[PDB]
Amino acid sequence: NYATVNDLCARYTRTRLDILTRPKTADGQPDDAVAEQALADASAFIDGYLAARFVLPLTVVPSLLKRQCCVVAWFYLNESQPTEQITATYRDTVRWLEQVRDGKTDPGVESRTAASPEGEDLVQVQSDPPVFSRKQKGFI
Amino acid sequence: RVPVALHHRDPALFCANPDNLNELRLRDASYHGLELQPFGWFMHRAKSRTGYVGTNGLVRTLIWPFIFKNYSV
């Protein structure tokens, strides 16, 4: 997963996270595996939206992707009855992921070293070996 | 005492004298250059155009059409 539960419980108040999680567990006591599973599902969502033009086991993780995983995990964790703002922000992050997939916006870099994640060649052409090109310094 | 063989040396070996500019002198890594040994150098200067020894060759005129034709080809 892109973001750990210790970050989702920091961006979103831990008490509200416990309130959301405690029903979903089998026993009925505050649990941590539910949040990790939701974060894994959100990371899978982002991975699917990024694999279009990136090598998906990201060499360097864009620093905004932690936020983009936390928001989607929060929406996935409020599926029974979400606030209007949660839905609006989830639609905004889906729009951002669609723009990233299409090519309108790059995901960003790692804020530590400003390195952008690599990916496979979106465009690739092959032609026959070049003959009579200007690089052939013979003749002329 | 007559010649038995006439070897055609490469024309690049000869540099015109910086003075008088009309005496071909064998290049010897010198400013003036080594002069030709007498009775041992059959020199034929075909002057198609009046001027000095380096000028009168047809390469001066033909270098431009050659370049244009080959670049176009």
Swiss-Prot record, chain A:
* Compartment(s): Host cytoplasm
* Null allele phenotype: Accumulation of unattached tails and full heads.
InterPro entries, per the entry: Phage_Mu_GpJ (IPR009752)
Q: What does the record note about the induction of this protein? A: Expressed in the late phase of the viral replicative cycle. Expression of late genes is activated by the viral late transcription activator C.
Q: Which GO terms describe its cellular component?
A: host cell cytoplasm
Where do the record's region annotations for Disordered lie?
A: 101-140
Say yes or no: keyword Cell cycle present. Answer: no
Record's keyword terms, sorted? Host cytoplasm, Late protein
Keyword flag Coiled coil = no
The entry's protein name is Gene product J
Native organism is Escherichia phage Mu
Identify the gene encoding this protein.
J
UniProtKB/Swiss-Prot annotation, chain B:
Q: Where in the cell is it found?
A: Virion; Host cytoplasm
Relate the induction remark in this record. Expressed in the late phase of the viral replicative cycle. Expression of late genes is activated by the viral late transcription activator C.
Q: Known post-translational modifications?
A: Cleavage by the viral I protease yields a C-terminally cleaved portal protein competent for DNA packaging and procpasid maturation.
Quaternary state and interactors? Homododecamer. Part of the immature prohead complex. Might interact with viral I protease; this interaction gives rise to an early 25S initiator complex. The scaffolding protein Z and the capsid protein T should then be added to this initiator complex to yield the immature prohead. Host GroEL and GroES are also essential for the correct assembly of viral head and tail.
The record describes the protein's role as:
Forms the portal vertex of the capsid. This portal plays critical roles in head assembly, genome packaging, neck/tail attachment, and genome ejection. The portal protein multimerizes as a single ring-shaped homododecamer arranged around a central channel. Binds to the terminase subunits to form the packaging machine. Acts as a linker between the capsid and tail. Required for attachment of the neck proteins to the capsid.
Q: What is this protein called?
A: Portal protein
